[PDB]
Design a protein around this ligand. Structure first.
Ligand code: Y6P
Ligand code: Y6P
Ligand code: Y6P
Ligand code: Y6P
Ligand code: Y6P
Ligand code: Y6P
Ligand code: CL
Lengths: 208, 208
């Protein structure tokens, strides 16, 4: 596409996009153009408004475009074109990506006792309500645990809420602990999209 | 009053105030209370909306209060109170003051020729369209010119636009230049509400 400002908008929160260069109050010669999941190619929005788009996006007295509640379908490109009283044309170009922060991740069904030298199911971590999906990762004493490595196996699962489209992630961690290691290791789970959300650590005990 | 967050809102621009602690989507147990120039003491706004207030301020799906175009009469106090799913009450308290930036100040009717030793009309400076009024100040070589001093006299005039309520300021500067000084001094005028807006300097000639 063209040079744009990248906007990240939270699902459910309002979004205001400025039409740069426009008159501060009506009358204004401006046009908004948007191409999102709600549109078949470009849709033109006028200051006069009207029609179904009035429940979704309206042009404000100052010429900004306002979306009361951003949803998944508003991902896309939003463009404004305006004229001054002087006569200069100004263009504004936005790449809108939407997001939702899931709830705090949770470790469920954790093991109390690992046996060094064999593979062990450590636990299952669950994140609910993210958009885009994101990923779950595991940590040992603060160091990141890399899958397909030192007897570390991770399996993951993504599910979509049938109506909101928000993702629920489930991650299963299996380790083979090393004979002669920390007999009380600390495992955590973190969600990464924005900062990271970490779980409460689990501290199982190992046969050495 | 009580402890509040101070909000400065530009006349003509939208304003969104977050109702902290509220659920991100309906159903929500929340109330907005506002006391501004549009109200006789407190006015309560509900998520259901309705009535004349729908042309002025509405409660968004996330419980924020939205004002499409702030005006002078929206100065005052905006309060929210909410219950989350856990059950805690959260309060949000805002003191909203509105403002407008005037256009660039201009020197009109400047003198090209001053005579040192007598009082001289240097010029007249004009600012249009501020809220609150603000004040005009004069500068000599970049250093601020203080009234009631070395033959420095300033007279000022404030006018109100009969429909928008915005202020137009007019300032007249009179100096008594000093014999033996800069024979080509530089005078500017600045508006102070936020940064300061300065005029193009005027450079008269002084007969020492
Ligand atoms: C009456 C009226 C005024 C303004 C826009 C629309 C649209 C529409 C155009 N693209 N997306 C929606 C429709 C429809 O979709 O039928 N009707 C409208
Ligand atoms: C109750 C309520 C609260 C907040 C916004 C709206 C809008 C609306 C404003 N801009 N875009 C949509 C409409 C509508 O007129 O459909 N109703 C609303
Ligand atoms: C590259 C670019 C950046 C920002 C705005 C535009 C517009 C445009 C938006 N409304 N009206 C026109 C157009 C075009 O449609 O030509 N191109 C643009
Ligand atoms: C201040 C004031 C003057 C006149 C009417 C109303 C209404 C109203 C509600 N439903 N129909 C009208 C409300 C409100 O309940 O928000 N406030 C008002
Ligand atoms: C009652 C009423 C009549 C006509 C327009 C609006 C708007 C509005 C239009 N563009 N932007 C905002 C709002 C609001 O969303 O507050 N209410 C309105
Ligand atoms: C001090 C203070 C800060 C923030 C909100 C409130 C509210 C209140 C707002 N809507 N509903 C109640 C009240 C009250 O009116 O009890 N006091 C408050
Ligand atoms: Cl007046």
């Amino acid at each position: 596409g063209a040079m744009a400002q990248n906007i990240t908008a939270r699902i459910g929160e309002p979004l205001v996009l400025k039409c740069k260069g426009a008159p501060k109050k009506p009358p204004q010669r401006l046009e908004w153009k948007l191409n999102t999941g709600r549109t078949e190619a470009w849709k033109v929005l006028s200051p006069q408004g009207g029609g179904p788009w009035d429940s979704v996006a309206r042009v404000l007295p100052n010429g900004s475009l306002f979306l009361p509640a951003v949803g998944i379908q508003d991902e896309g490109i939003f463009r404004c074109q305006a004229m001054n009283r002087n006569g200069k044309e100004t263009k504004s170009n936005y790449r809108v990506r939407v997001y939702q922060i899931p709830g705090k991740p949770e470790i469920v069904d954790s093991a109390s006792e690992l046996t060094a030298g064999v593979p062990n199911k450590v636990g299952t971590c669950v994140s609910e309500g993210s958009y885009p999906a994101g990923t779950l990762s595991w940590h040992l004493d603060g160091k990141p645990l890399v899958p397909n490595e030192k007897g570390v196996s991770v399996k993951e699962q993504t599910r979509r809420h049938p109506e909101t489209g928000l993702f629920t992630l489930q991650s299963e961690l299996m380790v083979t602990p090393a004979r002669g290691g920390d007999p009380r290791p600390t495992f955590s789970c973190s969600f990464s999209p924005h900062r990271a959300l970490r779980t409460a650590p689990i501290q199982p005990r190992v046969w050495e």
